[PDB]
Amino acid sequence: GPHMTTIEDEDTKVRKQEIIKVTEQLIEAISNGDFESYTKMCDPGMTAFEPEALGNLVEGLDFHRFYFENLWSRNSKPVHTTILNPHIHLMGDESACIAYIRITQYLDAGGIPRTAQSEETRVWHRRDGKWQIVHFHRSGAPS
């Protein structure tokens, strides 16, 4: 279009929104204890670092399934999630990386509104059309 003297290419804008959407979708699946949708979004050889893994690098979805079968009783109180200061890094058409602060507003524990924070890194890989998480790193203490 007009104004050729500059990168009129803002598909990077929509590509990033693409990544933000799948991340939101992933979080919703997690938040609703929907393990099926979750696995659908994760690469089988998915790798992860998270408080629940006590400093160990975990492989597969098997380890996460636990929390999706027991704590699945997730439905016991309201839980609003906010993704702050997102930053996406595009790497090829099949590879993306997103880092953001994850803020969770929940009740319970004494029945009072409380807020939890965690730093998250999600590494995305495009396979046969849909984006899948290949690795993620969570920092803080919340799930």
| Binding residues vs a copy of itself (CB under 8 A) | 2-3, 7, 43, 45, 47, 49, 52-59, 62-63, 65-67, 69-71, 73, 78, 80, 82, 84-85, 87, 89, 91-95, 97, 99-101, 103, 105, 107, 109, 111-113, 115, 117, 119, 121, 123, 125, 134-135, 137-140, 143
Tokens 């995305």 identify what position? Answer: 124
Nearer to a copy of itself, 36 or 92 (CB): 92
Neighbours of 69 (CB within 10 A): 11
- Residue 21 burial (C-beta neighbours within 10 Å; 0-12, 13-18, 19+): exposed
Nearer to a copy of itself, 29 or 102 (CB): 102
Alpha carbon distances (Å) from 99 to 55, 80, 90: 20, 19, 12
User: How many angstroms separate the CA atoms of 102 and 82, rounded?
Assistant: 6
Q: Supply the minimum distance, in Å, between the C-beta of residue 37 and a copy of itself.
A: 19
Q: Supply the minimum distance, in Å, between the C-beta of residue 57 and a copy of itself.
A: 5
Nearer to a copy of itself, 37 or 143 (CB): 143
User: How many angstroms separate the CA atoms of 64 and 52, rounded?
Assistant: 9
